[PDB]
């Protein structure tokens with residue numbers, strides 16, 4: 560009848576890791592450097 | 596907010612295409628130029644009756660200069 564505490568903790572940890580990875584997917588202001 | 600697009604390495608396919616095009620063009624542009632020059636400056640032969648008392652060479656029965664050669 561809902562999330563168990565172990566499921567809650569696992570989901571919280573996985574969500575934090577996923578959000579960190581998705582944030583890391585962003586591009587810096589210079590990332591597409593072009594060769595001469 | 597630009598994001599990173601995950602793609603398979605397209606460097607090798609592009610390199611192969613560039614190399615194939617380079618070699619084909621390297622050997623074909625001179626061929627096309629020579630064919631055009633031969634056509635423009637050495638036209639095809641003209642049909643004519645065989646003159647009396649004359650036998651033609653085996654290669655004198657074709658009209659295109661490249662085919663004759």
Ligand SMILES: CCCCCCCCCCCCCCCCCC(=O)OC[C@H](COP(=O)([O-])OCC(O)COP(=O)([O-])OC[C@@H](COC(=O)CCCCCCCCCCCCCCCCC)OC(=O)CCCCCCCCCCCCCCCCC)OC(=O)CCCCCCCCCCCCCCCCC
Pocket residue numbers: 615616619620623624626627630631634635638639
């Ligand atoms: C690349 C990467 C990708 C790789 C992919 C894989 C590729 C693999 C390739 C492997 C090798 C290829 C194998 C092919 C070898 C075959 C060679 C051959 O036999 O040549 C054939 C043929 C040569 O014929 P020929 O028997 O030697 O000549 C007989 C006559 O004696 C000649 O008559 P002539 O005395 O009138 O002389 C004409 C002469 C000269 O005629 C002219 O110059 C006149 C034309 C323009 C005049 C119009 C006026 C313009 C100027 C006027 C303005 C200035 C003055 C006024 C200025 C003031 C303005 C007010 O022109 C020519 O001789 C033709 C040029 C030959 C070029 C053929 C190239 C083949 C080489 C093989 C390797 C190719 C490698 C690819 C690279 C090629 C290069 C990029 O060449 C042609 O291709 C002719 C094509 C003409 C067709 C016209 C288009 C009509 C389309 C109708 C169909 C529509 C439906 C839709 C389809 C559309 C599709 C087009």
